[PDB]
Design a protein around this nucleic acid. Sequence first.
DNA 1: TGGATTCA
DNA 2: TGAATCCA
Lengths: 212, 209
Amino acid sequence: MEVEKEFITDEAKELLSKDKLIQQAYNEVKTSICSPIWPATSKTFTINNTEKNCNGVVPIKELCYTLLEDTYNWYREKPLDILKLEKKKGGPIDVYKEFIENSELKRVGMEFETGNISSAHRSMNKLLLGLKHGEIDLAIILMPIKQLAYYLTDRVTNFEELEPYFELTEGQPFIFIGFNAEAYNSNVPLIPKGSDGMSKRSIKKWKDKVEN
Amino acid sequence: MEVEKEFITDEAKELLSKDKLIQQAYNEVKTSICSPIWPATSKTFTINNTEKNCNGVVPIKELCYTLLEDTYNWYREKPLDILKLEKKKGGPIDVYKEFIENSELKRVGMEFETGNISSAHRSMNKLLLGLKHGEIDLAIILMPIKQLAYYLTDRVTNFEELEPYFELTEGQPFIFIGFNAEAYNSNVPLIPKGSDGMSKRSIKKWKDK
DNA sequence: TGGATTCA
DNA sequence: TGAATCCA
């Protein structure tokens, strides 16, 4: 996969240049979203473009999150965590990385949007409140760009659709990343739809192919 | 209907105290959300409380917007307006009031939330972007409070659910209003569910002016 | 399109 | 409470 669009607030540009551990976290997110390949035996990501909305997107999110957790030591909130935390402000931020950059504890929060545009507004606001409350020091949102979203689940959020609203994050360190497949064609399998599309074992096998 | 909860940003408080026409627009919204009665023969609003999620809420919004346009001259975006005004912003602000004052044109925009909490976040951000772009000078959001929402459509946005996020509006003139029924009991019919569980005719009859 | 409803 | 289907 490739990162074809990206927006970084001035505050995040500043933070990234002066904070090595925050920059490292950002680089790990970039590596995790660019790592996906398809088919699993390929070295690039080709999306099946047979017809509109023919592929699922959650499996890609699952792969991205597992890579961050298993390979880069990020923490992904588990169902048991979500159950005990979400009572007042909704579920917690999907995944994050934490580190003591001595004198203080810092955290980078990230969310991969696989829902509709309204859910993306909620995700951006969840991250913004986290920044305002000092719970995270940098927020990152990942989304497929429009060209790719055309072949993903109906009504899924795409980079360009949330873009008019990126300015609501000015003043805070926020980064939006838009990804795309390296190729489009009908000679590859469809990414399974439903959240159950790929089991917890298929994701592991795929991750294994991605890493070696 | 009654207003039981309300949050007004410091900037909105300031604006309301110094701008009479903006204060008037705000008073019209409050009057319009307090106007609803139920059943149509009562002077009060009693919501049927016999079963969780048993009533619709869209009809209340329909009534509220109609009162603002009809009685107070607000403008509510029509299907044809929405059809031509959408690119990457996601549809115009539901209703607004415009007026000339002190060498500048001012507008107040409002949205009544009848969708799920994610849609309320989108609505708040729509309004915030309008404020930031200078297209409106005051934003207002109406929502039923949690007690009432229990008896309205499953998953509808309620005041307390969005409240933790009101602070994302500080620095901008924004107002959030939480409304409630005056009474709860079984001796009233259910409010129909859906964009038209209650016809345009019925809403016309269901006035209270 | 959005609103609603029901199944997973 | 997200996903997919269906109609006011």
